[PDB]
Design a binder for this molecule. Structure first.
Ligand SMILES: [Mg+2]
Ligand SMILES: [Mg+2]
Ligand SMILES: [Mg+2]
Ligand SMILES: [Mg+2]
Ligand SMILES: [Mg+2]
Ligand SMILES: [Mg+2]
Ligand SMILES: [Mg+2]
Ligand SMILES: [Mg+2]
Ligand SMILES: [Mg+2]
Ligand SMILES: [Mg+2]
Ligand SMILES: [Mg+2]
Ligand SMILES: [Mg+2]
Ligand SMILES: [Mg+2]
Ligand SMILES: [Mg+2]
Ligand SMILES: [Mg+2]
Ligand SMILES: [Mg+2]
Ligand SMILES: [Mg+2]
Ligand SMILES: [Mg+2]
Ligand SMILES: [Mg+2]
Ligand SMILES: [Mg+2]
Ligand SMILES: [Mg+2]
Ligand SMILES: [Mg+2]
Ligand SMILES: [Mg+2]
Ligand SMILES: [Mg+2]
Ligand SMILES: [Mg+2]
Ligand SMILES: [Mg+2]
Ligand SMILES: [Mg+2]
Ligand SMILES: [Mg+2]
Ligand SMILES: [Mg+2]
Ligand SMILES: [Mg+2]
Ligand SMILES: [Mg+2]
Ligand SMILES: [Mg+2]
Ligand SMILES: [Mg+2]
Ligand SMILES: [Mg+2]
Ligand SMILES: [Mg+2]
Ligand SMILES: [Mg+2]
Ligand SMILES: [Mg+2]
Ligand SMILES: [Mg+2]
Ligand SMILES: [Mg+2]
Ligand SMILES: [Mg+2]
Ligand SMILES: [Mg+2]
Ligand SMILES: [Mg+2]
Ligand SMILES: [Mg+2]
Ligand SMILES: [Mg+2]
Ligand SMILES: [Mg+2]
Ligand SMILES: [Mg+2]
Ligand SMILES: [Mg+2]
Lengths: 82, 149, 141, 129
RNA sequence: ACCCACUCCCGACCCGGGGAGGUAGUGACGAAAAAUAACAAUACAGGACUCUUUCGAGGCCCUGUAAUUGGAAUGAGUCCACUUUAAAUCCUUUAACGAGGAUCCAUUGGAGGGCAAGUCUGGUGCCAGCAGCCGCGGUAAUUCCAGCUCCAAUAGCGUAUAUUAAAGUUGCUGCAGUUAAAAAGCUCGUAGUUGGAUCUCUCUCGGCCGAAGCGUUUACUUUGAAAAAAUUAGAGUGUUCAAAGCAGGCCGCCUGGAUACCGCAGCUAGGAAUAAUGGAAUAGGACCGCGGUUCUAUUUUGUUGGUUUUCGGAACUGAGGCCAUGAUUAAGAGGGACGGCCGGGGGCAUUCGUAUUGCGCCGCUAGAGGUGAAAUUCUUGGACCGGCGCAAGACGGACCAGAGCGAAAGCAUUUGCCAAGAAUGUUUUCAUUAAUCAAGAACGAAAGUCGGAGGUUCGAAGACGAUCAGAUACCGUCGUAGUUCCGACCAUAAACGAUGCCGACCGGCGAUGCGGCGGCGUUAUUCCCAUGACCCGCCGGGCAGCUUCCGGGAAACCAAAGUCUUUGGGUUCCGGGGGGAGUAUGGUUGCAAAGCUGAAACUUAAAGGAAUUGACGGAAGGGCACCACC
């Protein structure tokens, strides 16, 4: 305590903190590139998706809504964007 | 804290610092606008439009891409709700609780919650009157509440 | 807490006067019942006619007989018990004689031993009790 | 709800100084807050501070030197004329040798001595010593 | 009472009149000045100062019994004369007289504390009395009645009453509400109060200025003007000083009769931080030019005359160009969406569980019940007990926790339906929509009141039996209203965290409930990802707990009851010594019971809160003794 630099927070404890309580608020979510097991072409998906994302180029269900992060279908791969 | 509940929760979205469109986003402002228009024709409120665009089409903030908010976009072209969506949802909730109450006369929690919902409706309606969104003679009536929704 | 805004003057003033009514002295002075009930009628002194000499028991911790007189005020006819201060001074007072009475010292409240007595005799037959007590003047005939 | 952000900032810095901490973070920030912190700067009571630009409202990280006894706000922001300034500083300041009353006049935000020099009254904001 | 002499007024008026006014009289309302002695010599209690060795000396300086001396100085009085004045009086000026107890004699209140000054003497003896308060007095009274002495103010000083300060005990500055008096039972809600970031003067007229607008309007701040005198502050000025007055000063002159202040509102001109308010989002936009539509004032023009245009002015306007054409941010503010959950939250229906009571049958039966002991009470017209069934109502044990839910009262068998809800998640949406709340509303334990239905258990009242000196009680038997459901009233609780709500900051630690985010490794499984059950952390909102020299507090204690004389984040209610009294009265609500609002007379020096020692206890633990026991 006492002499603790609030100007230069450490990255680990900055991620440790709540998203709204950081020096500058940074959301915890991200955008994923989801690849279906059979379809050759990728889809952009929100991590905390609240809707049943359907394959635009097929009938496969890509993710299911949950309390927090959306659950990807088994086999459907994903890569973090940016 | 909550307006009508004792709870004091801290749960909301945290928009990022960067207001620039991400490079991977290949959608143009016009494409986003047409997607918004057809989603509105499907019968969705601006909230649902934003959720669908964020979930499936990979746009973070429509205002961030098109330089303009969703409701303004809908009102600009013409197809916008007669009364604001939050007021509409409040009226719908009040109608539902009233319908439940008229048959369950013994329910006293429902009466209390209904009064809370009416207070919220009145506050919102008075605010919208002061901003000229609603006509000054617009008033909430239980008899015509179901008609409005 | 109290209101502190720039436009709260009326609230502060109204609250202050309403709460002022809860003060014992302020209510006594401004309600008007105390002045009506006061036998002197707000005067410092009064004049009365001696009705009878009476002896009042002192309060319990000390035993004594306080020599007082029943007087009838001229200005309103109210009857009062007044204390005759010094010793032998009761012998200076007769029946049906003019007496000038003052307060006892605490604003209509009983003083010391004597119970329910708030007046003391100052003059008897237009001559001061102190002058009679000290032999400076004698009782008129 | 939160009103008068200046009061919250001054309370935060006062509590941090009572606790002996070397830096304090204040949020939300404001131009009134920055001007008050700068008049506290020029008299050596606070030290260097830095503004963090969150796109909603900035934060201020304030370095603290142990020279600050009290800093507070006066609400409501009463209008002060030149005649009554003496009474105000007699009430608020601990001495005539040190301490400052801060006020907004049309000339800006400044301590009572500068307001006397410029012959301008205004509205009282707070005090520090 | 005297007078129009002064200040002024009236009249026809230089002339008359004026109880206006002036002058005296009374006058301790109150304010200013100011006597009641000073000195010298002695003699000393004497003292300091001084040398000496103690005396002494030290005769320098001071004080006092000085009923010791001594002359000096005076005005209080008496009183000529002036002076004063309209006439006088007073004061001032001056003759004469006028002081040793200088008797030419200071009083009013006190002497335990508060509060300055006698536990000296005599008298009284809880009497008389004193004493604002605490108290003093019952035979040695520091308190009464007196003598002596002493002290406070002093030509004044006591007393009663109003009022101010003391009173931060009305609190704007600046008080309090856990336990001392105090936060509404809970929530909603109009008015009120308060409210998050954000935005760095010119075109025309007249002689470069003077003019004109208008920059949205202000509030605020500074200036200027206008604002009776007296009073207040204050400059000058020796009234002999002073309170006063506005006078006065120099050898005819010289010089005053200032200045400040005067809320608020109303005028005035600068400043533009702060704080409100507006300016384009049906473009009911700005600027340039255009074009139109209409009406109209005058140019025409030595003149006349003639004359409709032109020009000028407007309103109504339609196409254009141009604006970088016009929307700040999305609050660790707030609504509203959306997702997976979660919970004794609520309503309707349904279902189950024993138990209790009663009934039918069967068995053996003489007791069974109750209590400290009994009795009242049911019993061979089978009581109690055991077994098999039936019914009626009530209630949901153990699981059940310093766990959960609800605004609070309150909420626990299964299942279904119905509408709700917090938290968490969120790069959704609106965009200030908010906080607290007179008026006005919803809910509100139990008891109680009107109707129905039902009435198992328990049970106010009541009838008995016990106990007791007595028992209208505590214990026991029976038992009405009630207890249960529905529909209307009632709106009160120690409705309690005896602690308003919203927001910020200020220490640690381990748990726990819900949601989300990670991570080895065990389990359902036997293999697949799962998803559940554990385990190790993180975040957020909760019920709490321990700890701490955060800091507070009278302390108990409180991480809020902290961030308070270093006193101001917003806002509601509400207290002001104890009783009378939540009483009387009026109003209002209610069928009623009662609820809400709510005094005064009068009485009283304490009542009260925390904490410390003892004493006590029919509270719990130990220990000891043949004046205990074994
Ligand atoms: Mg609210
Ligand atoms: Mg005359
Ligand atoms: Mg005359
Ligand atoms: Mg007269
Ligand atoms: Mg005379
Ligand atoms: Mg007098
Ligand atoms: Mg005097
Ligand atoms: Mg004389
Ligand atoms: Mg004396
Ligand atoms: Mg004496
Ligand atoms: Mg005394
Ligand atoms: Mg003394
Ligand atoms: Mg006295
Ligand atoms: Mg005494
Ligand atoms: Mg007073
Ligand atoms: Mg004071
Ligand atoms: Mg007090
Ligand atoms: Mg209390
Ligand atoms: Mg409460
Ligand atoms: Mg309101
Ligand atoms: Mg603001
Ligand atoms: Mg004046
Ligand atoms: Mg003067
Ligand atoms: Mg003015
Ligand atoms: Mg937001
Ligand atoms: Mg027998
Ligand atoms: Mg049986
Ligand atoms: Mg059970
Ligand atoms: Mg009310
Ligand atoms: Mg009700
Ligand atoms: Mg009830
Ligand atoms: Mg009942
Ligand atoms: Mg009934
Ligand atoms: Mg019974
Ligand atoms: Mg009896
Ligand atoms: Mg009984
Ligand atoms: Mg009550
Ligand atoms: Mg209470
Ligand atoms: Mg969990
Ligand atoms: Mg995990
Ligand atoms: Mg937790
Ligand atoms: Mg305070
Ligand atoms: Mg309240
Ligand atoms: Mg009282
Ligand atoms: Mg009545
Ligand atoms: Mg009331
Ligand atoms: Mg105690």
């Amino acid at each position: 305590p006492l002499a603790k630099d609030l100007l230069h927070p450490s990255p680990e404890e900055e991620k440790r903190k709540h998203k709204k309580k950081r020096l500058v608020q940074s959301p915890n979510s991200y955008f994923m590139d989801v690849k279906c097991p059979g379809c050759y072409k990728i889809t952009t998906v929100f991590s905390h998706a609240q809707t049943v994302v359907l394959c635009v180029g097929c009938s496969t269900v890509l993710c299911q809504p949950t309390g927090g992060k959306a659950r990807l279908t088994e086999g459907c791969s994903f890569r973090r964007k940016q | 804290g909550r307006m009508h509940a004792p709870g004091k929760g801290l749960s909301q979205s945290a928009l990022p610092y960067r207001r620039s469109v991400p490079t991977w986003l290949k959608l143009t402002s016009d494409d986003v606008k047409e997607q918004i228009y057809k989603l509105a024709k499907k019968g969705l409120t601006p909230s649902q439009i934003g959720v669908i665009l964020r979930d499936s089409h990979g746009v973070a903030q429509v205002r961030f891409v098109t330089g303009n908010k969703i409701l303004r976009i809908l009102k600009s072209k013409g197809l916008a709700p007669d009364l604001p969506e939050d007021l509409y949802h409040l009226i719908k909730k009040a109608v539902a609780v009233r319908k439940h109450l008229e048959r369950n006369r013994k329910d006293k929690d429902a009466k209390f919650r209904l009064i809370l919902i009416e207070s919220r409706i009145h506050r919102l309606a008075r605010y919208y009157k002061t901003k000229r969104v609603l006509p000054p003679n617009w008033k909430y009536e239980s008899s015509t509440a179901s008609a409005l929704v | 807490g109290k209101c502190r805004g720039l436009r709260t003057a009326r609230k502060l003033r109204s609250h202050r006067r309403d709460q002022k009514w809860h003060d014992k002295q302020y209510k006594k002075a401004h309600l008007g019942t105390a002045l009506k009930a006061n036998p002197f009628g707000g005067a410092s002194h009064a004049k009365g006619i001696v009705l009878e000499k009476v002896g009042v028991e002192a309060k319990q911790p000390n035993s004594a007989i306080r020599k007082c007189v029943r007087v009838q005020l001229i200005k309103n006819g109210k009857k009062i018990t007044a204390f005759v201060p010094n010793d032998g001074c009761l012998n200076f007072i007769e029946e049906n004689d003019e007496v000038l009475v003052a307060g006892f010292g605490r604003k209509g409240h009983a003083v010391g031993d004597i119970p329910g007595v708030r007046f003391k005799v100052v003059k008897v037959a237009n001559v001061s009790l102190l002058a009679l007590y000290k032999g400076k003047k004698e009782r008129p005939r | 709800v939160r009103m008068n952000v200046l009061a919250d900032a001054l309370k935060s810095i006062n509590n941090a100084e009572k606790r002996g901490k070397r830096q304090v973070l204040i949020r939300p920030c404001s131009k009134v807050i920055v001007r008050f912190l700068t008049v506290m700067m020029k008299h050596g009571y606070i030290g260097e501070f830095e503004i963090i630009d969150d796109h909603r409202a900035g934060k201020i990280v304030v370095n603290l030197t142990g020279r600050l006894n009290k800093c507070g706000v006066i609400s409501p922001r009463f209008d002060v004329q030149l005649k009554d300034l003496e009474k105000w500083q007699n009430n608020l300041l601990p001495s005539r040798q040190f301490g400052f009353i801060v006020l907004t006049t049309s000339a800006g935000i400044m301590d009572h001595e500068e307001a006397r020099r410029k012959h301008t009254g205004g509205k009282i904001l707070g005090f520090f010593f």
